[PDB]
Design an enzyme around this catalytic site. Structure first.
Site, PDB file in Angstrom:
ATOM      1  N   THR A 243       0.839  -1.188   0.000  1.00 48.41           N
ATOM      2  CA  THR A 243       0.000   0.000   0.000  1.00 48.41           C
ATOM      3  C   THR A 243       0.873   1.236   0.000  1.00 48.41           C
ATOM      4  O   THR A 243       1.945   1.236   0.609  1.00 48.41           O
ATOM      5  CB  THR A 243      -0.992   0.019   1.167  1.00 48.41           C
ATOM      6  OG1 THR A 243      -0.290   0.067   2.410  1.00 48.41           O
ATOM      7  CG2 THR A 243      -1.872  -1.215   1.152  1.00 48.41           C
TER       8      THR A 243
ATOM      9  N   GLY B  23       7.207   3.445  -1.134  1.00 45.95           N
ATOM     10  CA  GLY B  23       6.474   2.249  -1.548  1.00 45.95           C
ATOM     11  C   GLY B  23       6.881   1.830  -2.962  1.00 45.95           C
ATOM     12  O   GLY B  23       7.073   0.648  -3.249  1.00 45.95           O
TER      13      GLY B  23
ATOM     14  N   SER C 216       7.431   5.712  11.992  1.00 41.87           N
ATOM     15  CA  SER C 216       8.248   6.878  11.673  1.00 41.87           C
ATOM     16  C   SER C 216       9.064   7.213  12.914  1.00 41.87           C
ATOM     17  O   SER C 216       8.624   6.921  14.030  1.00 41.87           O
ATOM     18  CB  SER C 216       7.336   8.052  11.354  1.00 41.87           C
ATOM     19  OG  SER C 216       8.088   9.268  11.381  1.00 41.87           O
TER      20      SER C 216
ATOM     21  N   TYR D 144       0.005  13.075  13.743  1.00 42.68           N
ATOM     22  CA  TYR D 144       0.766  12.171  12.891  1.00 42.68           C
ATOM     23  C   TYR D 144       1.717  11.332  13.748  1.00 42.68           C
ATOM     24  O   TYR D 144       1.754  10.110  13.642  1.00 42.68           O
ATOM     25  CB  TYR D 144       1.591  12.969  11.878  1.00 42.68           C
ATOM     26  CG  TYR D 144       2.544  12.123  11.066  1.00 42.68           C
ATOM     27  CD1 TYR D 144       2.112  11.400   9.963  1.00 42.68           C
ATOM     28  CD2 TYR D 144       3.896  12.071  11.385  1.00 42.68           C
ATOM     29  CE1 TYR D 144       2.984  10.612   9.215  1.00 42.68           C
ATOM     30  CE2 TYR D 144       4.775  11.276  10.660  1.00 42.68           C
ATOM     31  CZ  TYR D 144       4.330  10.575   9.556  1.00 42.68           C
ATOM     32  OH  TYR D 144       5.191   9.803   8.840  1.00 42.68           O
TER      33      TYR D 144
HETATM   34  N1  LIG Z   1      10.647  11.179   5.377  1.00 46.14           N
HETATM   35  C1  LIG Z   1       9.694  10.432   4.910  1.00 46.14           C
HETATM   36  O1  LIG Z   1       9.545  10.308   3.680  1.00 46.14           O
HETATM   37  C2  LIG Z   1       8.897   9.639   5.900  1.00 46.14           C
HETATM   38  C3  LIG Z   1       9.265   9.695   7.266  1.00 46.14           C
HETATM   39  C4  LIG Z   1       8.613   8.862   8.181  1.00 46.14           C
HETATM   40  C5  LIG Z   1       7.595   7.977   7.730  1.00 46.14           C
HETATM   41  N2  LIG Z   1       7.140   8.094   6.441  1.00 46.14           N
HETATM   42  C6  LIG Z   1       6.061   7.213   6.007  1.00 46.14           C
HETATM   43  O2  LIG Z   1       6.480   6.549   4.807  1.00 46.14           O
HETATM   44  C7  LIG Z   1       5.278   6.075   4.150  1.00 46.14           C
HETATM   45  C8  LIG Z   1       5.480   6.338   2.662  1.00 46.14           C
HETATM   46  O3  LIG Z   1       5.326   7.750   2.399  1.00 46.14           O
HETATM   47  P1  LIG Z   1       6.425   8.436   1.442  1.00 46.14           P
HETATM   48  O4  LIG Z   1       7.483   9.255   2.162  1.00 46.14           O
HETATM   49  O5  LIG Z   1       6.864   7.407   0.435  1.00 46.14           O
HETATM   50  O6  LIG Z   1       5.492   9.659   0.805  1.00 46.14           O
HETATM   51  P2  LIG Z   1       4.598   9.584  -0.563  1.00 46.14           P
HETATM   52  O7  LIG Z   1       5.542   9.487  -1.733  1.00 46.14           O
HETATM   53  O8  LIG Z   1       3.626  10.726  -0.486  1.00 46.14           O
HETATM   54  O9  LIG Z   1       3.810   8.208  -0.512  1.00 46.14           O
HETATM   55  C9  LIG Z   1       2.589   8.114   0.243  1.00 46.14           C
HETATM   56  C10 LIG Z   1       1.876   6.964  -0.441  1.00 46.14           C
HETATM   57  O10 LIG Z   1       0.704   6.534   0.255  1.00 46.14           O
HETATM   58  C11 LIG Z   1      -0.400   6.525  -0.637  1.00 46.14           C
HETATM   59  N3  LIG Z   1      -1.651   6.829   0.112  1.00 46.14           N
HETATM   60  C12 LIG Z   1      -1.868   7.915   0.856  1.00 46.14           C
HETATM   61  N4  LIG Z   1      -3.122   7.900   1.366  1.00 46.14           N
HETATM   62  C13 LIG Z   1      -3.675   6.716   1.005  1.00 46.14           C
HETATM   63  C14 LIG Z   1      -5.001   6.084   1.109  1.00 46.14           C
HETATM   64  N5  LIG Z   1      -5.968   6.644   1.886  1.00 46.14           N
HETATM   65  N6  LIG Z   1      -5.179   4.889   0.514  1.00 46.14           N
HETATM   66  C15 LIG Z   1      -4.268   4.345  -0.326  1.00 46.14           C
HETATM   67  N7  LIG Z   1      -3.000   4.836  -0.417  1.00 46.14           N
HETATM   68  C16 LIG Z   1      -2.680   6.006   0.200  1.00 46.14           C
HETATM   69  C17 LIG Z   1      -0.083   7.637  -1.627  1.00 46.14           C
HETATM   70  O11 LIG Z   1      -0.704   7.382  -2.896  1.00 46.14           O
HETATM   71  P3  LIG Z   1      -2.168   7.972  -3.305  1.00 46.14           P
HETATM   72  O12 LIG Z   1      -2.157   9.429  -2.911  1.00 46.14           O
HETATM   73  O13 LIG Z   1      -2.122   7.762  -4.803  1.00 46.14           O
HETATM   74  O14 LIG Z   1      -3.193   7.098  -2.620  1.00 46.14           O
HETATM   75  C18 LIG Z   1       1.410   7.370  -1.830  1.00 46.14           C
HETATM   76  O15 LIG Z   1       1.601   6.162  -2.601  1.00 46.14           O
HETATM   77  C19 LIG Z   1       4.093   6.824   4.807  1.00 46.14           C
HETATM   78  O16 LIG Z   1       3.432   5.931   5.762  1.00 46.14           O
HETATM   79  C20 LIG Z   1       4.804   7.955   5.549  1.00 46.14           C
HETATM   80  O17 LIG Z   1       4.046   8.510   6.630  1.00 46.14           O
HETATM   81  C21 LIG Z   1       7.782   8.858   5.500  1.00 46.14           C
HETATM   82  C1  LIG Z   2       7.801  14.302  10.559  1.00 49.56           C
HETATM   83  C2  LIG Z   2       8.956  13.380  10.465  1.00 49.56           C
HETATM   84  C3  LIG Z   2       9.366  13.126   8.911  1.00 49.56           C
HETATM   85  C4  LIG Z   2      10.808  12.987   8.804  1.00 49.56           C
HETATM   86  C5  LIG Z   2      11.604  14.376   8.744  1.00 49.56           C
HETATM   87  C6  LIG Z   2      12.386  14.846   9.763  1.00 49.56           C
HETATM   88  C7  LIG Z   2      12.471  14.008  11.000  1.00 49.56           C
HETATM   89  C8  LIG Z   2      12.834  14.778  12.299  1.00 49.56           C
HETATM   90  C9  LIG Z   2      14.073  15.653  12.132  1.00 49.56           C
HETATM   91  C10 LIG Z   2      13.766  16.713  10.945  1.00 49.56           C
HETATM   92  C11 LIG Z   2      14.246  18.042  11.115  1.00 49.56           C
HETATM   93  C12 LIG Z   2      13.963  19.031  10.133  1.00 49.56           C
HETATM   94  O1  LIG Z   2      14.484  20.303  10.337  1.00 49.56           O
HETATM   95  C13 LIG Z   2      14.664  20.651  11.706  1.00 49.56           C
HETATM   96  C14 LIG Z   2      13.184  18.689   8.997  1.00 49.56           C
HETATM   97  C15 LIG Z   2      12.681  17.347   8.841  1.00 49.56           C
HETATM   98  C16 LIG Z   2      12.954  16.332   9.841  1.00 49.56           C
HETATM   99  C17 LIG Z   2       8.776  14.319   8.040  1.00 49.56           C
HETATM  100  O2  LIG Z   2       8.710  15.434   8.336  1.00 49.56           O
HETATM  101  C18 LIG Z   2       8.225  13.723   6.894  1.00 49.56           C
HETATM  102  C19 LIG Z   2       7.723  12.220   7.375  1.00 49.56           C
HETATM  103  C20 LIG Z   2       8.551  11.817   8.362  1.00 49.56           C
HETATM  104  O3  LIG Z   2       7.806  11.138   9.380  1.00 49.56           O
END
Ligand SMILES: NC(=O)c1ccc[n+]([C@@H]2O[C@H](COP(=O)([O-])OP(=O)(O)OC[C@H]3O[C@@H](n4cnc5c(N)ncnc54)[C@H](OP(=O)(O)O)[C@@H]3O)[C@@H](O)[C@H]2O)c1
Ligand SMILES: CC[C@]1(C/C=C2\CCCc3cc(OC)ccc32)C(=O)CC[C@@H]1O
Ligand SMILES: NC(=O)c1ccc[n+]([C@@H]2O[C@H](COP(=O)([O-])OP(=O)(O)OC[C@H]3O[C@@H](n4cnc5c(N)ncnc54)[C@H](OP(=O)(O)O)[C@@H]3O)[C@@H](O)[C@H]2O)c1
Ligand SMILES: NC(=O)c1ccc[n+]([C@@H]2O[C@H](COP(=O)([O-])OP(=O)(O)OC[C@H]3O[C@@H](n4cnc5c(N)ncnc54)[C@H](OP(=O)(O)O)[C@@H]3O)[C@@H](O)[C@H]2O)c1
Ligand SMILES: NC(=O)c1ccc[n+]([C@@H]2O[C@H](COP(=O)([O-])OP(=O)(O)OC[C@H]3O[C@@H](n4cnc5c(N)ncnc54)[C@H](OP(=O)(O)O)[C@@H]3O)[C@@H](O)[C@H]2O)c1
Ligand SMILES: CC[C@]1(C/C=C2\CCCc3cc(OC)ccc32)C(=O)CC[C@@H]1O
Lengths: 249, 249, 249, 249
Positions: free
Chosen positions: C12, C19, C137, C150
């Site tokens: 997902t 993903g 996260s 979140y």
């Molecule tokens: N720094 C980071 O990037 C970071 C940090 C911590 C955790 N995360 C977690 O990593 C995971 C992946 O996110 P990402 O960073 O790869 O950002 P992203 O590129 O925006 O990917 C989010 C994905 O989830 C899908 N999605 C969102 N809402 C949904 C729904 N209701 N049903 C089905 N699919 C859904 C979106 O596609 P559609 O909009 O097409 O549905 C997209 O494929 C998330 O759980 C995010 O919270 C990311």
């Molecule tokens: C909310 C945490 C997370 C990861 C980014 C960090 C993680 C925490 C440290 C950090 C410091 C920054 O500047 C001070 C900017 C970004 C960040 C995002 O924002 C996107 C999804 C993911 O979950």
């Protein structure tokens, strides 16, 4: 004695178990206490028991309008809040395969949603340098059969203590989570299908814990008092386990 | 109400800093206290500041025979121990590349080895139901530049609270770690020489902590008192961070 | 050697970001992958980039009926699931004071509720011995300004890996959380509008992490592959931080 | 395949159990391996078993001169180190009341002192961007009867992973701790007083673990390989539990 003297406290979940024992201890330490809960029966039963310096307020913390009314009463009656104990909570067991939308929504509504709005709507009355205590649980760090939603919700609660530490530090308001293990109150056995399983449930809980018994409500009250009091004036964002060592060994 | 009335406490490193502040609070709460340290002058000075219900004892925790003498004195004067605060410790900074055998041994001998024997040798005097507090540190959960051995030693301390929880549960003795962040004591200036450098170091510590200040020794003492007192009677094996939020956000 | 040879994976949020990178790595390692997301265009685009051994499925995880359809498609095409990566999620920033019911529900519905039902509804297809990965996260263990809901939701996710460890151990299914720090995906720019602001935000994230850079999506995929693969066959219930050290020092 | 191709690894504790299974896996992935240990018997037995691309080096990691000799050999033979697995360790059970100075010193010498000097003396040969893995234990987060020194020492090991993350980040060297649960090797039963208790010890360990068995040495090897490999290129300072869920639920 005097450890909360002249301080105003608001306790949600206040008419039974942990919230009542907490109200009793807070009053012993000089506080004026609001106890909040849904049942007017218990709430006046409780306010009588506590006996002095306690007002009961009927509110369902899941309802925004009920919270507005609570804080209107607090504002009128006392003017400000020193201590908030956001203690409303409830556990229903369902395994993953059993979970229904209604069961999820009930769990998250009372344990997370209402907690968030409880604290949000307190902030205008909370004094700078005040203290907020959230009730999480050991479940929030364990993998307990059929506690899927409850444990997840209590982990969300502990998280909010961290975020709110960051958000409220400029106001010197401390936010900490208390994470009870097995405490002897209706929460333990508002679950068991009889009164046969009530005594043998507590024996298991006792056997799992290093101290080898369930805690008393007064002991959880005393730990909440620590976090409410100035003795914890350099404690912020923590998770205080009060579980006889259950999660620590 | 005096929360340690007529209780006997033994505090290692009670001639300075956190240990001294804790001795003063314990005596205010009705305890009789032994303070323990190497320096006779600071012992006499500390005893005088405390002013009553105190015996100072010169002992190096890294010498077993000094511990045996400490405990013979406690045995003669008071007969038993209710609270033991194993608090002596010291920080020296070296990076990994600068570590020598001597530096390693100096750090571990006082912070771990000495603490183990301090508790082992208290066991015959400790009452069932007694409370043991170990001083760990936020360093035990962080990766601080040039704190290699000290941080590792303080993690070892935190571990021992878990093991001793398990080993002493039959006697109902609670063992808990307290983990200070920056507290305003001589320990903070371990690596600085001038008054400016010290003030600067404290400002940085303040800026690093959510509460935005260094903790006072009295605040650490108050948290130790929690753990010493009956308020924490259902608390066992924990690590109580007293660090203004530093490790929690 | 192909580490997922002929295995069936369901991801997902597999049309973007982590993903998608994970889908590409899984296909390189011999898997057949279903990618799941709401946007048909990005699904088709992602499927084309992956280039083989992929079926894209339009489903909103917050709608139960969309999950039921997803799993009927998996059932028809492949028959069973070896690996499930419950990865969809989304961040919106609001402080405590700005939280609304809608914001709360938007965050929890995709990050927690949707994830629960995603896994529940996979159970009949999951093979004994299969692997489930949840995306948590670093926010789940931090106190980040304006990440109230979140962060709390992502702590709930981490919790569910522990519960599901316990509930699914009879079928030998492993469940593990992965907790990314800053990974270079659209999620990082959740609160910025211009190219400058985004570049600046990434620079700050780099400066906050010990490794001194934002992680690539391929690095997150590689850690997910660990958890998906037989290399992690004795790993269960964990939280695997992939954050350049941010939460660990 | 190829995941450590042409990389030079050094494994301490290399002639049995975890260190041998790790050497075998590293060689399968293309590495040249030094295995280090005290017994020349086993070491050549082991190097034969591994069969290719392995040099045995006799050294006692507790002795500084033995480490200087090891790294002189590594320098001569290979020029640099890519991967260091600092895996030397040993457990002897004693309760608090049983601890003797000799028992403490043996425990800390092999588990902490020698580990520190092992890594210190590697640093001149370690390549920028290299990977160091420390063997901690589940014991380092548990309260296990009669594991006082061992658990404390393994908590010290995990701490050093954090500190060295901070100290070595400028060189992009990653340092992570692996924390095995029960693994089927001589470490488990170089403890039991017979061969009666060997099978029933493993049954207990199995019963305590969610996956319901002891791990294989190869499974711990595979997790070490993850941390050694580029698949963990954004993983730093972590504690990777490999314990079938023992510490996680
Ligand atoms: N720094 C980071 O990037 C970071 C940090 C911590 C955790 N995360 C977690 O990593 C995971 C992946 O996110 P990402 O960073 O790869 O950002 P992203 O590129 O925006 O990917 C989010 C994905 O989830 C899908 N999605 C969102 N809402 C949904 C729904 N209701 N049903 C089905 N699919 C859904 C979106 O596609 P559609 O909009 O097409 O549905 C997209 O494929 C998330 O759980 C995010 O919270 C990311
Ligand atoms: C909310 C945490 C997370 C990861 C980014 C960090 C993680 C925490 C440290 C950090 C410091 C920054 O500047 C001070 C900017 C970004 C960040 C995002 O924002 C996107 C999804 C993911 O979950
Ligand atoms: N072993 C334990 O007891 C244990 C372990 C872990 C955590 N906890 C937590 O401790 C807290 C208190 O529980 P307890 O052990 O004292 O059990 P309890 O005796 O059942 O008390 C729970 C309280 O929550 C109140 N409450 C429930 N829903 C509410 C709502 N919608 N609005 C306002 N108040 C509400 C109840 O009062 P009304 O019904 O009158 O509203 C009741 O007083 C809870 O968050 C619980 O989950 C307890
Ligand atoms: N920010 C902080 O202040 C901070 C942070 C984290 C943890 N800690 C821990 O807090 C504890 C108290 O230190 P502090 O800050 O109060 O600093 P302090 O004022 O220097 O106190 C250290 C005390 O320990 C005693 N001591 C040291 N070595 C000893 C030995 N071998 N035997 C007997 N006693 C010994 C010292 O007295 P003698 O020299 O007279 O023996 C002194 O009483 C220590 O364990 C320290 O590591 C402090
Ligand atoms: N259940 C488990 O097996 C488990 C659980 C937690 C942690 N661990 C840890 O995993 C690591 C490896 O142990 P294992 O399970 O594979 O048991 P093992 O078969 O006994 O292996 C331990 C290794 O350490 C080496 N070693 C001991 N002292 C040494 C010294 N002074 N210099 C150099 N090498 C030395 C030994 O070789 P020589 O005797 O030839 O030197 C041996 O190969 C240890 O740190 C251990 O504490 C194991
Ligand atoms: C080593 C940790 C500890 C507490 C200080 C901190 C704790 C960590 C944060 C901090 C940041 C600073 O400036 C960046 C300066 C000081 C600090 C000391 O040094 C003295 C003992 C105690 O154990």
């Amino acid at each position: 004695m005097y450890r909360l003297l002249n301080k105003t406290a608001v306790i949600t979940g206040g008419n039974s178990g942990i919230g009542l024992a907490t109200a009793k201890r807070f009053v012993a330490e000089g506080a004026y206490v609001f106890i909040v809960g849904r049942r007017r029966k218990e709430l006046e039963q409780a306010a009588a028991e506590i006996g002095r310096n306690v007002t009961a307020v009927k509110a369902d913390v899941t309802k925004l309008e009920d919270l507005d009314r609570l804080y209107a009463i607090v504002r009128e009656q006392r003017g400000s809040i020193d201590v908030l104990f956001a203690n409303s909570g409830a556990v229903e067991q369902k395994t993953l395969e059993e979970i229904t939308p209604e069961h999820y929504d009930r769990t998250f509504d009372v344990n997370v949603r209402g907690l968030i709005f409880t604290v949000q709507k307190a902030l205008p009355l909370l004094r700078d340098g005040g203290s907020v205590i959230l009730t999480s649980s050991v479940a929030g760090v364990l993998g307990l059969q059929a506690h899927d939603t409850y444990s997840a919700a209590k982990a969300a609660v502990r998280s909010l203590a961290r975020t709110w530490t960051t958000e409220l530090k400029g106001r010197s308001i401390r936010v900490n989570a208390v994470s009870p293990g097995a405490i002897d109150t209706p929460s333990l056995e508002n679950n068991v299908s009889t009164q046969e399983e009530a005594d043998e449930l507590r024996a298991k809980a006792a056997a799992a814990t290093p101290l080898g018994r369930v805690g008393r409500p007064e002991e959880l009250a005393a730990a909440v008092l620590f976090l409410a009091s100035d003795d914890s004036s350099y404690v912020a964002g923590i998770e205080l386990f009060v579980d006889g060592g259950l999660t620590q060994v």
